[PDB]
Amino acid sequence: NISENTSSAESRIRDTDMAEEMVEYSKNNILAQAGQSMLAQANQSTQGVLSLLQ
């Protein structure tokens, strides 16, 4: 019984809650795609220079 409770206690401190962590995984997965999108747009975003009298 003390083993079952201190297993439960340690599992609370250290095992991943996979439900919760897939929220935080997937925020960062969308943000990474939106970041790569913005970087890919930003590298095109200075093609504006080339019409200016050139």
Place this chain on the structure above:
Amino acid sequence: NISENTSSAESRIRDTDMAEEMVEYSKNNILAQAGQSMLAQANQSTQGVLSLLQ
């Protein structure tokens, strides 16, 4: 973060804003064509000598 903000800083001090310099290049390019055209006519200036009791 600091390296981005001092790249932003130094870029402000040192990089040509190509929009602003293509104004000043084009002023001087038109002035040079105008001043060439003006020097060409200023060399025809004293052609008036040759009809003058000659």
